[PDB]
């Protein structure tokens, strides 16, 4: 409703861009990283950070690109972080209607077009 | 310094008079417990990668002779000493033996011998094995402790017959593993040992040994085992163990209480951890008792203090082992290897994973059918362990037909039958999966080998070196063709380097430093390092020596720093 906290389901420059707008607006922020982006600055440039694509709940060690395109994980870190909204940035998920219906099968506000327009 | 008088007659004179059989009966009959000092072989094998040099070992033999003339024997040859001495110390193991024999004419000299291949690295024909035993006897060994890494008696017979044929003591060892008091591992029960003892006696043993290579025998078990052993055979029993667990001295004392005829220990400075338990303290515990061995504790201390100063020169070869480890009961890695191993794990970025290993080793051991693990079988089980660790694999994972696993060569080789046969046989499926169409066999590996043409073989080594080789050198060449060849070439380049003191052999001479060096008994060189030049172009360094007063310049490449 009143957006307090945004998770950016992406990386690098796109993630940093969204972080900046979030900050200036007083919105708190959440970054995700795969293990290969262990060192990436976008995971430090957020007020909170979580790994995506490894661990006890998996069931395979995930890929570096895969890790970012994974609905389950994205939702997971959204739900665990306490995120009211997700910005998908561009590429990756951002045009996946599956991922949208999921934001809101999880009641999480999706920054972008409704799933119908998307299909 | 000891001593003024000549030397007291000891077990050496006793064996010469009685012969081996009557001599094992005399051991059996003795009230006092008998002691073997393993400092000169197993102590540094376990603690210093077997890098102890002849120089330090031979200078002490005469003191053992005058100060502890009641010792049963000095274990001082075989195990890894044979090839290590030439490969890594550029010295000849025969010369080592002949010098120990000269300095302690009153004590038995003992070696560890693998039945299947003597001191070698692979399988050899019977005649070669025979030839080795004959030379070892000629060169001073009195007591051969002979073992098989799977406790397969069949695989020991040729060695046992060759020892008796030479009229030496044949001590046939049984490797201890598992736990006779735990009924959940029935394959190594009491009966397992007493039946081997009886097979070994029928095969001609003069003495039976229990070789607890991993330090696994616990005191309540020693009491049961040594009682039962000395009821199942009339032969003397000789107990060798390792202190990995930190309680092996309790096991030895339990064994002595139970009637054991002889035991092994290392001098204090080279005992504990993966070595034998402490000689001076075991002696001190028995002092005044019924079985008192009569060894002077003030001499043991003095010889220990000498070994402590010797050990300090070998800092390059110390491991990181800090003390007792009861996880030996879980993994059963033999003391003689829990360190060559500790740093195969290093060389593979496993150092911080070293525990999961431990558990892979017990697991691997069991998938193999649960076997005796001792040089080279442990090696095989280690290679399996590291691999289940690296390639991150489990045992169903290892025996499943679907999952490709390329096996370590040592594992392929064992399953083929190159180390022999466990009682047992190898697990079918694992064998088929690992062999990749290579065909296994189940007979004694020795018995497949063609006789060596000993003449042809002698001429090959002789043509290569362009001189005659001695009988001893020829035995060396049979065991390790390539390591002997390189040693012979290095000797011809560098001279009798075994005669240098240890700090000089490993580090050379400081500026201005003086050294006495015996090129031979009674030919002493005085050598002073006067100065060492800056390296030149063409990249040569000249070292200015004084040799017996006279200046000598020697030029060497400066390999350190890139010069040819």
């Amino acid at each position: 409703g009143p957006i307090s906290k945004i998770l950016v389901a992406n990386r690098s420059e796109i993630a940093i861009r969204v972080f900046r707008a979030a900050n200036e607006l007083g919105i708190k922020t959440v970054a995700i990283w795969a293990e290969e982006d262990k060192l990436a600055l976008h995971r430090f440039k957020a007020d909170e950070s979580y790994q995506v694509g490894r661990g006890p709940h998996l069931a395979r060690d995930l890929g570096p690109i895969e890790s970012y395109l994974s609905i389950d994980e994205v939702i997971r870190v959204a739900k665990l972080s306490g995120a009211d909204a997700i910005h998908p940035g561009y590429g990756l998920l951002s045009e996946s209607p599956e991922f949208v219906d999921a934001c809101n099968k999880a009641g999480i506000i999706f920054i972008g077009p409704k799933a119908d327009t998307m299909r | 310094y000891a001593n003024g008088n000549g030397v007291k007659d000891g077990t050496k004179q006793l064996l010469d008079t009685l012969g081996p059989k009557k001599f094992g009966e005399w051991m059996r009959n003795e009230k006092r417990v008998l002691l073997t000092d393993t400092t000169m072989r197993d102590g540094h094998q376990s603690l210093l990668a077997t890098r102890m040099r002849t120089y330090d070992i031979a200078r002490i033999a005469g003191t053992y002779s005058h100060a502890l003339p009641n010792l049963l024997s000095l274990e001082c040859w075989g195990g890894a000493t044979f090839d290590v001495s030439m490969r890594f110390l550029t010295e000849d193991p025969w010369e080592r033996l002949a010098l120990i024999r000269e300095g302690a004419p009153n004590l038995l000299l003992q070696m560890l011998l693998r039945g299947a291949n003597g001191v070698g690295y692979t399988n050899y024909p019977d005649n070669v094995v025979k030839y080795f035993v004959r030379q070892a006897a000629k060169g001073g060994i009195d007591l051969f402790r002979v073992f098989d890494c799977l406790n397969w008696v069949e695989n020991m017979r040729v060695s046992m017959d060759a020892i008796a044929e030479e009229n030496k003591l044949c001590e046939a060892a049984i490797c201890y593993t598992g736990d006779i008091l735990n009924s959940a591992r029935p394959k190594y029960d009491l009966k397992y040992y007493t039946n081997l003892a009886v097979e070994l006696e029928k095969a001609g043993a003069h003495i039976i040994a229990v070789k607890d290579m991993a330090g696994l025998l616990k005191p309540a078990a020693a009491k049961v085992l040594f009682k039962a052993l000395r009821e199942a055979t009339g032969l003397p029993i000789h107990f060798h163990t390792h202190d990995t667990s930190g309680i092996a001295a309790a096991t030895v004392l339990a064994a002595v209480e139970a009637g054991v005829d002889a035991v092994d220990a290392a001098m204090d400075a080279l005992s504990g951890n993966t070595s034998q338990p402490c000689l001076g303290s075991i002696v001190e515990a028995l002092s005044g008792s019924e079985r008192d061995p009569g060894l002077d504790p003030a001499w043991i201390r003095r010889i220990s203090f000498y070994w402590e100063a010797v050990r300090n020169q070998y800092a390059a070869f110390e491991s990181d082992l800090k003390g007792p480890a009861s996880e030996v009961y879980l993994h059963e890695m033999p003391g003689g290897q829990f360190t060559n191993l500790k740093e195969q794990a290093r060389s593979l970025g496993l150092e911080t994973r070293w525990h999961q290993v431990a558990q892979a080793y017990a697991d691997a051991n069991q998938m193999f059918g649960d076997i005796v693990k001792v040089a080279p079988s442990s090696k095989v089980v280690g290679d399996m362990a590291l691999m289940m660790v690296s390639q991150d694999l489990t045992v169903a994972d290892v025996v499943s037909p679907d999952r490709e696993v390329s096996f370590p060569e040592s594992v392929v080789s064992m399953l083929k039958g190159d180390l022999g046969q466990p009682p047992s046989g190898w697990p079918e499926a694992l064998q088929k999966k690992a062999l990749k169409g290579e065909k296994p066999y189940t007979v004694r590996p020795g018995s497949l080998l063609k006789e060596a043409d000993l003449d042809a073989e002698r001429k090959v080594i002789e043509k290569k070196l362009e001189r005659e080789v001695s009988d001893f050198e020829f035995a060396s060449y049979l065991m390790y063709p390539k390591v002997f060849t390189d040693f012979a070439l290095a000797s011809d380049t560098y001279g009798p380097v075994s005669v240098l003191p240890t700090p000089a052999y490993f580090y050379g001479l400081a500026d201005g430093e003086e050294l006495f060096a015996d090129i031979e008994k009674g030919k002493t060189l005085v050598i002073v390092n006067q100065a060492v030049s800056a390296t030149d172009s063409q990249g040569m360094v000249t070292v200015f020596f004084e040799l017996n007063g006279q200046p000598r310049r020697i030029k060497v490449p400066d390999r350190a720093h890139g010069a040819t």
Binding site: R20, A21, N23, E24, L25, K45 | -
Partner: protein, 129 residues
């Protein structure tokens, strides 16, 4: 968006000497309205990471976050008269004292350790079972 930078002397590796003015970089932030301009300067400044020399960053943040600044109620006398921009008592405070230990041991070593063997590097941390 809406950040201009005009560098003076700073980059990764720069040598800053004591002889001239102490400027590293001027930051300019733009926006359609004045408040949003302030939050953009504020976001930019806090995001700076400058290692090797101390900087005035936290003072600049206290200037632009201050209420008299935000509702344009300040005069030329504002800074000279506003003590809580200059918050000054030697700080500490648990974390600060802890940083001070680590600083000091990092630069100077620990007397009990500094002349003695060192543990094998990248050693396994102890893991509680």
């Amino acid at each position: 968006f809406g950040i201009r930078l005009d560098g003076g002397t700073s980059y990764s590796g720069a040598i800053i000497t004591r002889y001239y003015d102490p400027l590293l970089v001027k930051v300019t932030a733009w926006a359609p309205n004045p408040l949003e301009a302030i939050s953009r300067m504020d976001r930019a400044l806090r995001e700076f990471r400058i290692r090797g020399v101390a900087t005035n960053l936290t003072f600049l943040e206290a200037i632009i976050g201050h209420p008299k600044f935000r509702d344009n109620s300040y005069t030329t006398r504002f800074i000279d008269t506003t003590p809580e921009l200059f918050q000054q008592v030697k700080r500490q405070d648990r974390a600060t004292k802890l940083l001070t230990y680590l600083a000091d041991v990092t630069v100077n070593g620990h007397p009990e350790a500094k002349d003695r063997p060192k543990p094998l590097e990248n050693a396994a941390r102890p893991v509680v079972p």
